[PDB]
């Protein structure tokens with residue numbers, strides 16, 4: 228149940244004025260595509276607070292990637308769902324190495340100890356299994372929504388309840404203006420992740436997805452099952468978990484899609500006009516240095 | 521539980537191309553505004569057919585308004601939810617005057633015998649009470665979604681699963697391009713339907729709303745209760761059931777808004793360029809004669 232909104236004073240939504248003229252703001256299956264200017268955060272905050280919404284945020288900090296935790300959590304405190312209940316879930320092989328970040332009221336952090344796979348490919352891919360496992364163990368009773376992100380990142384601006392929905396994917400910043408033929412989907416038919424050349428809506432980033440606990444539970448379970456079939460078949464998807472994520476979101480359409488404001492790399496891409504805000508962004512790293520012992 | 525969609529070939533959604541540049545396609549609370557050009561019906565049909573969706577359609581034909589039934593029903597067969605399970609509910613004081621209209625496969629019609637009120641105002645307003653009663657009696661078991669419309673209407677083009685959502689209202693054709701101060705909301709603070717000159721998102725039409733049975737139940741019961749409070753306070757809202765629908769949808773935001781394609785009057789308004797399709801339209805009638813003996 229949802230009680231009545233209180234009286235609010237805000238500008239009238241003009242029916243004959245498009246909210247954006249430079250970008251697509253709704254998918255052909257009527258999912259909103261979340262850009263700045265498409266929402267009034269005041270209305271959405273009211274809606275979500277009146278539900279006492281608790282948002283879980285999962286992040287994996289395995290082996291050397293513990294180094295990204297401090298900036299990730301400090302910026303999450305400044306920008307991620309401020310005013311709402313938040314439960315951080317840090318998956319790590321090194322519980323002692325989780326920095327002691329001071330948290331706002333109504334926000335808590337849990338450390339979930341897990342195994343460190345040797346191969347970086349397995350570290351990234353096994354996040355699906357691990358999320359799925361803890362959806363059972365913990366998240367179903369603890370939180371309403373889950374948001375699942377990469378750690379080598381920082382919040383630079385608002386990430387709030389505008390993203391919340393049963394299932395969401397984010398536009399990968401490298402491909403939002405590309406034709407589907409250029410998307411780096413899995414193209415080998417022997418993989419469970421395969422998408423043919425004439426299919427695909429968007430190229431979603433592996434670094435930012437989520438939804439309700441139930442929907443994230445289903446997504447991560449499915450992606451993990453597809454990975455195991457691939458492994459038994461002696462194939463490993465070209466872009467690992469992001470490939471299986473893309474396959475899943477093609478056949479199970481997300482109920483919102485996040486613009487690349489939510490997933491960016493300023494060093495490689497600048498700050499284009501179509502991006503009114505840069506919300507969540509890559510922290511520079513040396514792949515070979517950081518991903519191996 | 522949702523099964524995967526099958527393989528489908530369709531044009532790629534273009535992120536840097538707006539689907540409409542002339543109209544607002546999403547509300548500030550991230551509810552789609554349904555216009556032609558915003559949806560791919562093939563994907564939506566797939567989505568809803570896979571869930572085995574049943575749509576109820578309520579229509580009141582009390583006293584002389586039985587005359588409208590034939591054209592309403594014949595055109596519904598041509599244009600309303602074709603391919604999906606439909607259940608028409610005809611509320612009438614004259615069961616024998618319901619025309620024997622031939623129905624497509626998977627479609628059925630039930631006659632709901634109710635009282636006739638003397639005043640047109642009460643016939644219109646009392647639909648809220650009657651819908652609400654039958655939401656308990658029949659609808660919750662029988663259908664997934666309810667579509668609640670005026671009978672003095674004909675379908676002229678597609679009205680399909682693009683409208684379906686937990687709660688929707690429709691932009692009144694007379695007001696979509698108006699400033700909120702010109703909306704004919706109830707303006708007397710003495711009425712439960714009162715909305716101040718500085719509030720209001722849209723002027724929703726009383727002739728087309730719906731949603732899940734759960735949400736329609738809530739809306740209709742709330743609107744009836746508000747009418748009864750007003751009755752005890754010796755006030756009748758200016759636009760009757762429509763006034764109360766408008767107060768309700770201000771405080772409980774619909775999860776889709778239908779554009780005026782879905783509620784039009786060509787005689788009064790012509791055929792403007794922002795209307796790519798005229799889907800559901802008023803049949804000419806004389807007020808003086810049809811609303812009274």
Ligand SMILES: O=c1ccn([C@@H]2O[C@H](COP(=O)(O)OP(=O)(O)O)[C@@H](O)[C@H]2O)c(=O)[nH]1
Nearest residue numbers: 287288289290292347350351377378379518
């Ligand atoms: O040694 C590793 C490798 C990966 N990861 C996690 O898996 C994510 C995905 O890896 P990465 O960010 O390297 O993928 P990229 O953004 O570079 O494509 C990282 O953000 C971490 O959350 C980790 O914790 N330790």
Ligand SMILES: O=c1ccn([C@@H]2O[C@H](COP(=O)(O)OP(=O)(O)O)[C@@H](O)[C@H]2O)c(=O)[nH]1
Nearest residue numbers: 580581582583585640643644670671672811
């Ligand atoms: O004598 C009446 C008066 C009203 N209605 C029903 O109530 C709706 C609202 O009335 P009407 O269409 O006249 O309202 P208008 O479109 O003129 O505002 C109609 O479409 C009918 O379904 C009816 O059945 N018989």
Ligand SMILES: [Mn+2]
Nearest residue numbers: 377378379434
């Ligand atoms: Mn990363």
Ligand SMILES: [Mn+2]
Nearest residue numbers: 670671672727
């Ligand atoms: Mn009418």
